[PDB]
């Protein structure tokens, strides 16, 4: 499952219950086109991977990480781990995805 | 002014019409945050930056070019000079629409 954070509290506490785990974050928008294409494949990753932490975040409902993160295009794929970030996807572009998923997990 | 391209034959006779000059394309859609939160700031661009030319793609509208050209978020923008692609940049990153303008003029 994709777990929704629901703010910035939240969200620190996601990237402390992932512990060692690679964390994936997607930032998305309710209406982009993009988004709803990925969408249902980051679902069957986050279920086939299940030692890497899926998060998602609305950067309408959530524009103070949004904009923490600089988040340019929807979606975003922020790659994490121990608190670090290790990279970053802009865009739905899914094997790009699944390469840095197997890169950093 | 940002020209709105209205299919593939348009698309390559804007192109053509450039000349020598350095085209950048907005490819963007209508729901999209950052589309419009950098839709002024490119007109204005469109403005100061004269002898470039300025295109924009609705991907809804024109999906076959859009998937020509791999979009995978919007905005995306795309350089191209002398029927040479240069350069893309994914988002609504200002600074960085700045120096690839410069880097490619």
Redesign the interface.
């Known amino acids: 499952m994709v777990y929704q954070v629901k703010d910035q509290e939240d969200f620190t506490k996601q990237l402390n219950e992932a512990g060692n785990k690679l964390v994936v974050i997607d930032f998305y ?1 309710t ?4 988004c709803k294409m990925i969408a249902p494949k980051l679902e069957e990753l986050s279920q086939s991977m299940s030692d890497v932490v899926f998060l998602k975040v609305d ?2 409902e959530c524009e103070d990480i949004a904009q923490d993160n ?7 794929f922020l790659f994490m781990k121990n608190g670090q970030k290790l990279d970053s996807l ?4 899914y094997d790009k995805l699944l390469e840095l998923v197997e890169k950093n997990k």
Chains 1, 2 share one sequence.
């Open positions: 928008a209406a982009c086109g993009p950067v309408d600089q988040i340019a295009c929807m979606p975003t802009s865009g739905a572009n």
